[PDB]
Amino acid sequence: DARDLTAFQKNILTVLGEEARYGLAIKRELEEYYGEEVNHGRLYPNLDDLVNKGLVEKSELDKRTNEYALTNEGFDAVVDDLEWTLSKFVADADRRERVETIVADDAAAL
Amino acid sequence: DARDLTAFQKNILTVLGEEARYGLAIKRELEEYYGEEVNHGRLYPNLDDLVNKGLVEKSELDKRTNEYALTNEGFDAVVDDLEWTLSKFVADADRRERVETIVADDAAAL
Ligand SMILES: [Cl-]
Ligand SMILES: [Cl-]
Ligand SMILES: [Cl-]
Ligand SMILES: [Cl-]
Ligand SMILES: [Cl-]
Ligand SMILES: [Cl-]
Ligand SMILES: [Cl-]
Ligand SMILES: [Cl-]
Ligand SMILES: [Cl-]
Ligand SMILES: [Cl-]
Ligand SMILES: [Cl-]
Ligand SMILES: [Cl-]
Ligand SMILES: [Cl-]
Ligand SMILES: [Cl-]
Ligand SMILES: [Cl-]
Ligand SMILES: [Cl-]
Ligand SMILES: [Cl-]
Ligand SMILES: [Cl-]
Ligand SMILES: [Cl-]
Ligand SMILES: [Cl-]
Ligand SMILES: [Cl-]
Ligand SMILES: [Cl-]
Ligand SMILES: [Cl-]
Ligand SMILES: [Cl-]
Ligand SMILES: [Cl-]
Structure with a gap:
């Protein structure tokens, strides 16, 4: 699994x-x-890590700009952690109601 | 902020x-x-960190039950991260349906 990634790496995948x-x-x-600046020197080494791990794919567009995308393995890692988070959070009917309201409001805002 | 927590600390809160x-x-x-051993010396120093951050407390449910528990602030931290994750995951109708199904299947297991 990708369950050993840092929070920062997991947030990139999200x-x-x-x-x-x-x-x-x-x-x-x-x-x-984060509500805080993120330095180029933190972001890009972590992007390279995720590409080397096969979770992210890179597409060069000119020379200063790349486009990054989840691989299917990277998407599986996002889903796996969401499923675990939800398995622990959805502990009773009130928790279920809270989650369903979040999901429906996010979809309505699209 | 709670958004600066390590992955390990966030997983305790979960x-x-x-x-x-x-x-x-x-x-x-x-x-x-994780699918790997978690040492005493990793878990308990981080539990102490979360207690000092006001996100976890030692609660005494009754005279013979003293457990770790989320504070109100810790619960807010868990909800906050779930909301952000879902705001990025629920990106179209099929993603919406996927999360609805995860939640329904979790609820059915209760
Ligand atoms: Cl981390
Ligand atoms: Cl991190
Ligand atoms: Cl995380
Ligand atoms: Cl760029
Ligand atoms: Cl840009
Ligand atoms: Cl963009
Ligand atoms: Cl998650
Ligand atoms: Cl799971
Ligand atoms: Cl598991
Ligand atoms: Cl309930
Ligand atoms: Cl709730
Ligand atoms: Cl409901
Ligand atoms: Cl609600
Ligand atoms: Cl122990
Ligand atoms: Cl305490
Ligand atoms: Cl114990
Ligand atoms: Cl227990
Ligand atoms: Cl035990
Ligand atoms: Cl709680
Ligand atoms: Cl989350
Ligand atoms: Cl959010
Ligand atoms: Cl999907
Ligand atoms: Cl059902
Ligand atoms: Cl069932
Ligand atoms: Cl059923």
């Missing part, structure tokens, strides 16, 4: 689970999550 | 989101997740 993105756009999504 | 637990029980749940 970002790419929404859609494929350029490196700079991943950085912005992570900054919005 | 375990306690299911129910309050004795330390040895947290260890078991984490070992089932």
Whole structure:
């Protein structure tokens, strides 16, 4: 599994689970999550790690810009952790109601 | 913030989101997740960290039950990360349906 990834690496995969993105756009999504700046020197070595692990695929677009996307193995890692999180969180009917409301509101906002 | 926690620390919170637990029980749940041993010396220093951060407490349910449990702030942290994860995962109708099915199957197992 990918269950030994860092939180930062897992968050990259979560970002790419929404859609494929350029490196700079991943950085912005992570900054919005953390509420803090994310340095290029942290992001890109971690992207290279995820590509080497087969969880992310890279597509070069010019010379300063790459597009990154989940592989199926990377998507499986996102789903695996979501399934585990939900298995623990959905502990009674009120928890089930909370989750279902979140999902339906996210879908309605699309 | 709770968004700066390590993956290991976030996984403790997830375990306690299911129910309050004795330390040895947290260890078991984490070992089932990771598929590798989790040493005393990794788990308990991090439990102490989460207590000092106000996310976990030692609770005394009755006179003979003293377990680890989420504080209100710890529960907020678990919900906050689930909300962010779902906001990125629920990216179209098929993703919506997938999460609905995960939740329904979890609920049925209760
Ligand atoms: Cl981490
Ligand atoms: Cl991290
Ligand atoms: Cl994480
Ligand atoms: Cl983008
Ligand atoms: Cl870029
Ligand atoms: Cl960009
Ligand atoms: Cl998750
Ligand atoms: Cl699971
Ligand atoms: Cl309930
Ligand atoms: Cl709830
Ligand atoms: Cl309901
Ligand atoms: Cl609700
Ligand atoms: Cl227990
Ligand atoms: Cl114990
Ligand atoms: Cl123990
Ligand atoms: Cl026990
Ligand atoms: Cl498992
Ligand atoms: Cl305490
Ligand atoms: Cl709680
Ligand atoms: Cl999550
Ligand atoms: Cl959010
Ligand atoms: Cl899907
Ligand atoms: Cl059902
Ligand atoms: Cl059933
Ligand atoms: Cl049934």
